[PDB]
Amino acid sequence: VYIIPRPFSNFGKKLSTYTKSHKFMIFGLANNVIGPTGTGTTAVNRLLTTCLAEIPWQKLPLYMNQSEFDLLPPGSRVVECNVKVIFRTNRIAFETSSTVTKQATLNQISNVQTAIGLNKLGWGINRAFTAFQSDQPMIPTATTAPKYEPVTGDTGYRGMIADYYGADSTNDTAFGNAGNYPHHQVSSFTFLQNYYCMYQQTNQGTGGWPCLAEHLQQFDSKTVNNQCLIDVTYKPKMGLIKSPLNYKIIGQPTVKGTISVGDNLVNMRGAVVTNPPEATQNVAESTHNLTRNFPADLFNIYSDIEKSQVLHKGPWGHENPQIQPSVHIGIQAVPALTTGALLINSSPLNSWTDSMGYIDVMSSCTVMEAQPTHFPFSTEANTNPGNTIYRINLTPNSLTSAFNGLYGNGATLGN
Amino acid sequence: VYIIPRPFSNFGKKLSTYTKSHKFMIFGLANNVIGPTGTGTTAVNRLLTTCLAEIPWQKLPLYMNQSEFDLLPPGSRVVECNVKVIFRTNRIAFETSSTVTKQATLNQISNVQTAIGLNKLGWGINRAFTAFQSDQPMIPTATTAPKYEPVTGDTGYRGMIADYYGADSTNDTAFGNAGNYPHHQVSSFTFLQNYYCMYQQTNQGTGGWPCLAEHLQQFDSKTVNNQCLIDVTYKPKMGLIKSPLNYKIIGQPTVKGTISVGDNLVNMRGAVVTNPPEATQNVAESTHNLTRNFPADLFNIYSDIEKSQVLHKGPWGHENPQIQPSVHIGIQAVPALTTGALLINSSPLNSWTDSMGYIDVMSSCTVMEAQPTHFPFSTEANTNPGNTIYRINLTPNSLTSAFNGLYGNGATLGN
Amino acid sequence: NPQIQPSVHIGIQAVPALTTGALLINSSPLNSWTDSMGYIDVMSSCTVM
Amino acid sequence: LANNVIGPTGTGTTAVNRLLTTCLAEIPWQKLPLYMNQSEFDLLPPGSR
């Protein structure tokens, strides 16, 4: 016999990896005297606060910097990504001042506490960055939208990205005897600017503060010291982190006979879905759900600096004509605040010794992809509806994780 | 102990592969009555001609089409690439005409002949495409610059690329009941538009026609039939086939203290070189060489359609501060022309039966690369002078393979 | 003598990353640094002949 | 040395340039004196390597 052997274009797959040794610092925020509504909009609500600092193992920059992100081909997806942290140690002040209250001591009793899922999974909210108190200054005071990207009231504070990497050889605001430093690139401590807490208001629903204590472990620091207590990882359910691959429109009849309607009776589910819980009540709640299904294909990102954009996009990026769900887990590292030696008369506990923990965190991830083309003269990378990908758009934020679950993230913006 | 583990950015390597089943056709060009100087410029010179058709296993398009080429990242280099060909068969005419001379016959005696290195290595030139004769029309007549890219005297003929792939969904000149067809993409025969021959003039040097016969093998076709006689491959010495990677200018003292001169006493050779044979003679030659060394870093290609550009660039692309040499081998497939049954009175042999061979050729290659970045805010892929690459520019063509060796290719343009 | 070659003496560094001040609460820039000095014990030797 | 806030051009000649600084102290294992003193050096015959 004699078969003439067919052609083949095997497009290979780039698969990179990234790591970085961040040196984060936490404070023992005194079991944060709950602050009432961070906004003049929710005014009657509060936040029981913890010192549980948040490691942003979901914001792309924890893993890679500008360029590396910048240079990822379309269809680039994060495969898995991990964080391991070591309680490198904590430091507690020494009252010299005798002043007040706070009896001076060479004693020290502190204790680490870590926690995972809480965030996403439990009943809380990451609300941090804050605004706070004078000596016995560990409890804090102003809530605020958690900071990952940079914030500014014309002056600006922040830049996760730049906090770790510095500026551009030309950028003024940084570079300088004194301006925005390369930190990561040259080992530096930097803080974990978000801590976590729980929200809850007054009357439209009520029963008390649930129990965090049974959702985070606590160690005698010194014991756990210089030993790593974190090391959990996430393999995003859908981490297409660069604008997807365009399916090309060059097949044949109607699918390009014209750009008209090409629709068909399949008899299998093919659209993304939606729950809208109708909370209504008169002394403890009464709900109602209504599945809403919806559309698909418009883009994923733009500003390019949307590296400071979220990671697992399981609730909106439906790849090809089908479906799915789930939320990136969340992770917190920290030390319960050291209590002042407030002698005799303390029968309230409210004096807190300043203390800062140096947690050593390494982050890594894979992300990878292909760059295929199936048409002889087609310009761009290209695939087929067989997969093409598809987003599902909305007026406000899609699942605004900066405000507490119902497992998936409500899509609306808190505080 | 406790070492804080360093970072790492492992940039992966895309490595693709390509193949294509071309169906080429050759004619038994009658042992080509040598044509005098193809140009009114070399007028007194000639070309002993063979039917040895040339398989362009050096022009990128034999392997991949537009897109695939088009989409290769910078620093993309062809790793190895192979061709295997099968004497699928040949066909010889049947004189009905009795006419002339050429007695009609159901007989058939033909014979394949293949050859490799000759091209590059021996004493010849690929000069083809031609312009020729009436019945007993296999010998040809007009030499011409070999065609790989497309040629045109405002009307145009050719397009290797388009010969194999057709036009663009919009391009007029093709697409059409009747215009430039996708051939490859939908199995079609197409011809191997170049054959090979030997040059030689009259008086400035002389001794006769060397012996091709001992540099190409000949088989009894029918025997070798449907069996592959080629299968040689080339792993280019330097096949950077896309504009290289830019080394970035951000280190430190003088190397960016300023953009000045940063030169140094190394005591090791670091520049590309040059031979200029001084052929001068008075009844058989007298030569003199003079090594010329020269520069380095300006670009590799531009028009984008420089896919129709050559493959092994061993004589001009010096990677990093060092050196090297060598030429892509060359390859020919074909059938010696079937002689007419010119009875009795033939005591010259010059009547030739039209015959065409269908050679089945599959081509493939690898080419691959990385896309790394070592600076936090650097935009582009980037490396270091450690390698950066460097070209060596000249007024005319660099090694114009379309005119015979001296092993490397002379850099000047023939016929 | 009438010939050739190249290469650079390697280089070597010893030290401690600077100890950060306990800058409580309000530090959300890190720029306070505790003075600290390391006593590194170094022995050097060579042959020449 | 506190992860040295980069100093712009040490000279009024390169003025627009900077130095990201480390505390990495340099051990001069290349300057002859780290190894031997005056005399010992002083007394080496020619061709001493």
Side-chain angles (χ1 to χ4, degrees):
Chain A
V1 87
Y2 172 54
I3 283 192
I4 295 194
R6 66 246 281 104
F8 175 34
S9 305
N10 183 232
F11 296 94
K13 195 176 58 55
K14 260 169 54 46
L15 181 253
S16 310
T17 51
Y18 301 106
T19 122
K20 322 193 201 77
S21 180
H22 293 129
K23 307 213 201 79
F24 296 138
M25 300 205 94
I26 303 322
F27 294 95
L29 279 271
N31 218 277
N32 342 117
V33 145
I34 86 277
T37 303
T39 169
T41 69
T42 35
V44 272
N45 130 318
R46 24 236 83 223
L47 282 153
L48 211 211
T49 7
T50 82
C51 43
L52 279 49
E54 162 224 46
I55 302 171
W57 132 106
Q58 106 257 36
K59 282 309 178 172
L60 237 63
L62 193 61
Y63 314 69
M64 83 282 244
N65 63 53
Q66 251 305 260
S67 309
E68 13 216 63
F69 167 66
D70 245 12
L71 289 67
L72 312 178
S76 284
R77 18 188 44 91
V78 179
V79 191
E80 174 179 45
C81 75
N82 174 73
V83 176
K84 352 171 193 135
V85 323
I86 309 72
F87 171 46
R88 181 55 168 296
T89 193
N90 89 303
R91 302 192 279 180
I92 306 172
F94 184 60
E95 297 303 354
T96 359
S97 48
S98 182
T99 8
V100 222
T101 346
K102 316 311 176 176
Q103 308 82 209
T105 210
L106 357 64
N107 273 268
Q108 300 180 0
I109 214 34
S110 179
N111 50 203
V112 174
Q113 56 186 223
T114 61
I116 316 308
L118 77 192
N119 34 85
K120 308 315 181 207
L121 306 302
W123 19 242
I125 182 195
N126 265 111
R127 180 43 58 257
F129 212 101
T130 22
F132 62 116
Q133 65 153 169
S134 58
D135 236 288
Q136 328 295 96
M138 305 294 278
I139 301 265
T141 337
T143 60
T144 75
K147 313 184 180 174
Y148 309 131
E149 70 295 272
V151 271
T152 298
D154 171 69
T155 27
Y157 354 78
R158 294 287 313 157
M160 202 154 132
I161 121 191
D163 204 357
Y164 302 161
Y165 317 122
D168 318 68
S169 297
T170 34
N171 169 91
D172 55 307
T173 42
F175 240 83
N177 190 290
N180 312 3
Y181 280 157
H183 282 137
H184 177 264
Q185 307 295 107
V186 280
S187 212
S188 287
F189 317 73
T190 170
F191 309 73
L192 262 188
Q193 338 248 169
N194 277 300
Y195 291 15
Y196 146 110
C197 34
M198 24 230 273
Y199 228 19
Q200 163 52 38
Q201 100 284 42
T202 315
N203 151 340
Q204 252 14 308
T206 273
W209 282 118
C211 182
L212 228 210
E214 62 175 90
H215 294 94
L216 55 109
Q217 340 68 5
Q218 328 177 39
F219 313 85
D220 194 7
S221 57
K222 62 203 69 288
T223 46
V224 75
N225 152 277
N226 233 64
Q227 219 326 113
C228 109
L229 9 297
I230 253 180
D231 211 304
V232 307
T233 170
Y234 183 68
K235 218 163 195 166
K237 157 157 300 182
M238 224 311 273
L240 180 271
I241 60 153
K242 281 293 186 179
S243 276
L245 234 306
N246 264 2
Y247 130 64
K248 218 52 59 186
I249 218 58
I250 352 204
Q252 194 170 347
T254 60
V255 192
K256 292 328 107 136
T258 164
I259 68 155
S260 229
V261 289
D263 74 327
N264 47 212
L265 324 310
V266 45
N267 324 294
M268 299 334 222
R269 331 250 47 100
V272 257
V273 182
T274 290
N275 287 163
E278 199 188 320
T280 81
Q281 105 278 254
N282 50 329
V283 183
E285 57 299 274
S286 184
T287 62
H288 330 54
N289 297 8
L290 319 82
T291 52
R292 303 189 197 191
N293 276 222
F294 48 176
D297 180 0
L298 180 60
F299 258 88
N300 290 44
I301 300 180
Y302 192 78
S303 161
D304 180 0
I305 318 308
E306 289 327 287
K307 53 162 302 196
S308 262
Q309 176 175 353
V310 284
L311 232 156
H312 183 227
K313 305 158 268 276
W316 55 282
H318 98 97
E319 219 138 358
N320 114 90
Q322 286 72 63
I323 17 52
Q324 250 172 329
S326 60
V327 64
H328 192 143
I329 307 302
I331 47 187
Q332 274 102 350
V334 269
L337 201 65
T338 323
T339 0
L342 66 186
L343 54 33
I344 319 158
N345 306 295
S346 246
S347 288
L349 208 1
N350 52 190
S351 298
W352 304 116
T353 306
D354 318 58
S355 44
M356 173 170 70
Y358 158 22
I359 307 204
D360 232 317
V361 167
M362 164 119 140
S363 186
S364 43
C365 74
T366 49
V367 180
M368 49 56 147
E369 78 334 295
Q371 295 109 103
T373 158
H374 258 67
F375 290 131
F377 280 92
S378 92
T379 165
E380 300 180 0
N382 75 277
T383 35
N384 33 61
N387 54 49
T388 60
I389 193 149
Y390 298 108
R391 102 206 280 313
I392 197 43
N393 315 48
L394 234 317
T395 318
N397 58 281
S398 276
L399 303 219
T400 300
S401 235
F403 60 90
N404 335 3
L406 252 168
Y407 239 90
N409 292 280
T412 117
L413 188 51
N415 200 105
Chain B
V1 87
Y2 172 54
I3 283 192
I4 295 194
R6 66 245 281 104
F8 175 34
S9 305
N10 183 232
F11 296 94
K13 195 176 58 55
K14 260 169 54 46
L15 181 253
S16 310
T17 51
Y18 301 106
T19 122
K20 322 193 201 77
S21 180
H22 293 129
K23 307 213 201 79
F24 296 138
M25 300 205 94
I26 303 322
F27 294 95
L29 279 271
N31 218 277
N32 342 117
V33 145
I34 86 277
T37 303
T39 169
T41 69
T42 35
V44 272
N45 130 318
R46 24 236 83 223
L47 282 153
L48 211 211
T49 6
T50 82
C51 43
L52 279 49
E54 162 224 46
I55 302 171
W57 132 106
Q58 106 257 36
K59 282 309 178 172
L60 237 63
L62 193 61
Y63 314 69
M64 83 282 244
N65 63 53
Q66 251 305 260
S67 309
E68 13 216 63
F69 167 66
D70 245 12
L71 289 67
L72 312 178
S76 284
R77 18 188 44 91
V78 179
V79 191
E80 174 179 45
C81 75
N82 174 73
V83 176
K84 352 171 193 135
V85 323
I86 309 72
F87 171 46
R88 181 55 168 296
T89 193
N90 89 303
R91 302 191 279 180
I92 306 172
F94 184 60
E95 297 303 354
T96 359
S97 48
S98 182
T99 8
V100 222
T101 346
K102 316 311 176 176
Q103 308 82 209
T105 210
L106 357 64
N107 273 268
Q108 300 180 0
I109 214 34
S110 179
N111 50 202
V112 174
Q113 56 185 223
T114 61
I116 316 308
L118 77 192
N119 34 85
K120 308 315 181 207
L121 306 302
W123 19 242
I125 182 195
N126 265 111
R127 180 43 58 257
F129 212 101
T130 22
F132 62 116
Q133 65 153 169
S134 58
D135 236 288
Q136 328 295 96
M138 305 294 278
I139 301 265
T141 337
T143 60
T144 75
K147 313 184 180 174
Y148 309 131
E149 70 295 272
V151 271
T152 298
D154 171 69
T155 27
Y157 354 78
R158 294 287 313 157
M160 202 154 132
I161 121 191
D163 204 357
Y164 302 161
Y165 317 122
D168 318 68
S169 297
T170 34
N171 169 91
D172 55 307
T173 42
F175 240 83
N177 190 290
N180 312 3
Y181 280 157
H183 282 137
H184 177 264
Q185 307 295 107
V186 280
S187 212
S188 287
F189 317 74
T190 170
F191 309 73
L192 262 188
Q193 338 247 169
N194 277 300
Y195 292 15
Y196 146 110
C197 34
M198 24 230 273
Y199 228 19
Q200 163 52 38
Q201 100 284 42
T202 315
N203 151 340
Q204 252 14 308
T206 273
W209 282 118
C211 182
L212 228 210
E214 62 175 90
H215 294 94
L216 55 109
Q217 340 68 5
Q218 328 177 39
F219 313 85
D220 194 7
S221 57
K222 62 204 69 288
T223 46
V224 75
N225 152 277
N226 233 64
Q227 219 326 113
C228 109
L229 9 297
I230 253 180
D231 211 304
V232 307
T233 170
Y234 183 68
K235 218 163 195 166
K237 157 157 300 182
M238 224 312 273
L240 180 271
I241 60 153
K242 281 293 186 179
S243 276
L245 234 306
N246 264 2
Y247 130 64
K248 218 52 59 186
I249 218 58
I250 352 204
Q252 194 170 347
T254 60
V255 192
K256 292 328 107 136
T258 164
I259 68 155
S260 229
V261 289
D263 74 327
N264 47 211
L265 324 310
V266 45
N267 324 294
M268 299 334 222
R269 331 250 47 100
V272 257
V273 182
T274 290
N275 287 163
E278 199 188 320
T280 81
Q281 105 278 254
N282 50 329
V283 183
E285 57 299 274
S286 184
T287 62
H288 330 54
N289 297 8
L290 319 82
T291 52
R292 303 189 197 191
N293 276 222
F294 48 176
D297 180 0
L298 180 60
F299 258 88
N300 290 44
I301 300 180
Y302 192 78
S303 161
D304 180 0
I305 318 309
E306 289 327 287
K307 53 162 302 196
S308 262
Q309 176 175 353
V310 284
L311 232 156
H312 184 227
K313 305 158 268 276
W316 55 282
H318 98 97
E319 219 138 358
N320 114 90
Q322 286 72 63
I323 17 52
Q324 250 172 329
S326 60
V327 64
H328 192 143
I329 307 302
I331 47 187
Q332 274 102 350
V334 269
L337 201 65
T338 323
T339 0
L342 66 186
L343 54 33
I344 319 158
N345 306 295
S346 246
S347 288
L349 208 2
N350 52 190
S351 298
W352 304 116
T353 306
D354 318 58
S355 44
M356 173 170 70
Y358 158 22
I359 307 204
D360 232 317
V361 167
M362 164 119 140
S363 186
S364 43
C365 74
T366 49
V367 180
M368 49 56 147
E369 78 334 295
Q371 295 109 103
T373 158
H374 258 67
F375 290 131
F377 280 93
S378 93
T379 165
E380 300 180 0
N382 75 277
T383 35
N384 33 61
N387 54 49
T388 60
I389 193 149
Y390 298 108
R391 102 206 280 313
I392 197 43
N393 315 48
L394 234 317
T395 318
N397 58 281
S398 276
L399 303 219
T400 300
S401 235
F403 60 90
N404 335 3
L406 252 168
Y407 239 90
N409 292 280
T412 117
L413 188 51
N415 200 105
Chain C
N1 114 90
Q3 286 72 63
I4 17 52
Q5 250 172 329
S7 60
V8 64
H9 192 143
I10 307 302
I12 47 187
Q13 274 102 350
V15 269
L18 201 65
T19 323
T20 0
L23 66 186
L24 54 33
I25 319 158
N26 306 295
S27 246
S28 288
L30 208 1
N31 52 190
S32 298
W33 304 116
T34 306
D35 318 58
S36 44
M37 173 170 70
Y39 158 22
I40 307 204
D41 232 317
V42 167
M43 164 119 140
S44 186
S45 43
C46 74
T47 49
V48 180
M49 49 56 147
Chain D
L1 279 271
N3 218 277
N4 342 117
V5 145
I6 86 277
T9 303
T11 169
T13 69
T14 35
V16 272
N17 130 318
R18 24 236 83 223
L19 282 153
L20 211 211
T21 6
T22 82
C23 43
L24 279 49
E26 162 224 46
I27 302 171
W29 132 106
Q30 106 257 36
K31 282 309 178 172
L32 237 63
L34 193 61
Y35 314 69
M36 83 282 244
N37 63 53
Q38 251 305 260
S39 309
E40 13 216 63
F41 167 66
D42 245 12
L43 289 67
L44 312 178
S48 284
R49 18 188 44 91

